[PDB]
């Protein structure tokens, strides 16, 4: 066991998925700030197979999974892995494809019905419409598996209408719309309190 790094320490039943926009709408330095936000959030969670489980995926035209929910590693090592996520700078970061991945790979089987399941979709870009044909189907699929989708729009190129589409599919799908990556550290305490509140204590 590893002791808490902060007074805020979420010890609840939660599967938390971090989906990181891999597009070039974020510079390499801005992506660094996004990764620091993910690490900051992880430091405030009790990461363990019996408490908070985390997954970290960078999405472009396709997914690169760095951490899976079932990965039995020390929190310190998971935070190190997240801090070493490589910059992609891709042209396309498809929200449809990464939500498909979340629905059909991460939550293909619900191992923990007693836990809340939350997807933090950190978006900085807009995928081409030719990739969005099944976007609503995937968001609806996640709703049916009781997966809460929380879009975090970052910067002026975030897909605002997909964010609004996500909010409409289920009332749990609250959105956070930010000016830039610099705002992540300022809203972090609010976001993690909100996510913790969504999870049960027992």
């Amino acid at each position, epitope marked *: 066991s590893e*002791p*808490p*790094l*902060h*007074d*805020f*320490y*979420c*010890s*609840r039943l939660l599967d938390l998925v971090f989906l990181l926009d891999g597009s070039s709408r974020l510079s390499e330095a801005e992506f660094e700030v996004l990764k620091a936000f993910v690490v900051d959030m992880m430091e405030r969670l*009790r990461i363990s197979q*019996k408490w908070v489980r985390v997954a970290v995926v960078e999405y472009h035209d396709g997914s690169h999974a760095y951490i899976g929910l079932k990965d039995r590693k020390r929190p310190s090592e998971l935070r190190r892995i997240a801090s070493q996520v490589k910059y992609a700078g891709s042209q396309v970061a498809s929200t449809s494809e990464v939500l498909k991945y979340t629905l059909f790979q991460i939550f293909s089987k619900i191992d923990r019905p007693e836990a809340s399941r939350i997807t933090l979709l950190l978006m900085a870009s807009q995928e081409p419409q030719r990739m969005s044909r099944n976007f609503v189907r995937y968001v609806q699929g996640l709703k049916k598996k009781k997966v809460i989708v929380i879009p975090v729009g970052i910067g002026p190129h975030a897909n605002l209408k997909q964010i609004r589409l996500i909010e409409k599919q289920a009332p749990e799908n609250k959105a956070f719309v930010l000016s830039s990556v610099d705002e992540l550290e300022q809203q972090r305490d609010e976001i993690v*309190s909100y996510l*913790c509140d969504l999870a049960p*204590e*027992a």
Partner: nanobody
Amino acid sequence: EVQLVESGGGLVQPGGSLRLSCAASGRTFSYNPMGWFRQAPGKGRELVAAISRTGGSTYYPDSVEGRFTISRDNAKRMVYLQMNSLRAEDTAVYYCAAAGVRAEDGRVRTLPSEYTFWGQGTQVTVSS
């Protein structure tokens, strides 16, 4: 559950020292904000020391401030109360307690109603 077990009480002369220990266990223990209460014979329970989840903040009432020190060891899941310059009026049963109301907030807790989990108490007697 959360389980708490205290030790370290004793019989001391005025001016003496003790160091109470409280061992926490149970799967739902989350390095909760912890506190020490004391109960003089036939009276109520009073919070005499409190500490945050990390240990970076503490609280004592002015009646024991300067003389009591609360600390914790999260690797060992322990909390401690060092009691210096003991006075006759410190005679009481001392209880270790853990806050279980919105425990994700690890700040120091001063309200007794925030304390959910309790040890069995250890006796401190100060007599000349």
